[PDB]
């Protein structure tokens, strides 16, 4: 009722963090599309509203950095409770599962691969926010906006994996 409640907290906090990542990504895409439209209206034809738009893009990136910090500490305490159970139950022990079937090392690998994917995607977003306001080739501008929108380091099947914890916690009805 202690470790299982930590799984109950961890799956719900995972789902809530994915929802706030999607809201911040929509705000960032609207600000970046306005930045590119202001740049092409500059070059086809100033620093205050361009600096203001770059500053709210920086505030969006700071919010995503805070979400990644909470992701890293959630995976770290999941690693800590799996190592605590592995130290407490000994080596040669056939452990019954906390829910019906799954052991806790599967939760550790799910959290590790989700953490790796979102950590790579945040670094690509920092490079896009570095290089967006200075470039002049419009194909590269469309490529940078497509890298913001389509998120090429976040894979689709990991959503299926998130729903596996939603059938290991029970927030969704069986």
């Amino acid at each position: 009722s202690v470790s299982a409640r930590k799984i109950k907290d961890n799956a719900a906090d995972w789902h809530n963090l994915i929802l706030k990542w999607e809201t911040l990504n929509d705000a960032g895409f609207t600000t970046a599309n306005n930045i590119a439209n202001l740049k092409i209206s500059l070059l086809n034809k100033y620093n205050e509203e361009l600096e203001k738009l770059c500053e709210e893009l920086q505030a969006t990136l700071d919010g995503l950095t805070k979400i990644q910090v909470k992701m890293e500490k959630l995976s770290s305490t999941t690693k800590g409770i799996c190592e605590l159970e592995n130290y407490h139950y000994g080596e040669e022990s056939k452990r019954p599962p906390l829910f019906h079937t799954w052991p806790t090392t599967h939760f550790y690998e799910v959290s590790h691969k989700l953490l790796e994917m979102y950590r790579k995607e945040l670094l690509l977003k920092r490079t896009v926010a570095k290089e967006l306001a200075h470039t002049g080739d419009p194909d590269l501008t469309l490529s940078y906006l497509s890298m913001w929108l389509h998120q090429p380091y976040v894979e689709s099947d990991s959503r299926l994996h998130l729903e596996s914890m939603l059938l290991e916690t029970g927030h969704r009805a069986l």
Binding site: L50, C54, L57, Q58, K130, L132, A133, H134
Partner: peptide, 26 residues
């Protein structure tokens, strides 16, 4: 010193300051 030129962060390292009274540093 840290300045953000249009989103790009810059790292500046100060080597020498020469002031108004003519006294320089090392």
């Amino acid at each position: 010193l840290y300045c953000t030129f249009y989103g790009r962060p810059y790292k500046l390292q100060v080597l020498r300051v020469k002031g108004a009274d003519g006294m320089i540093l090392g």
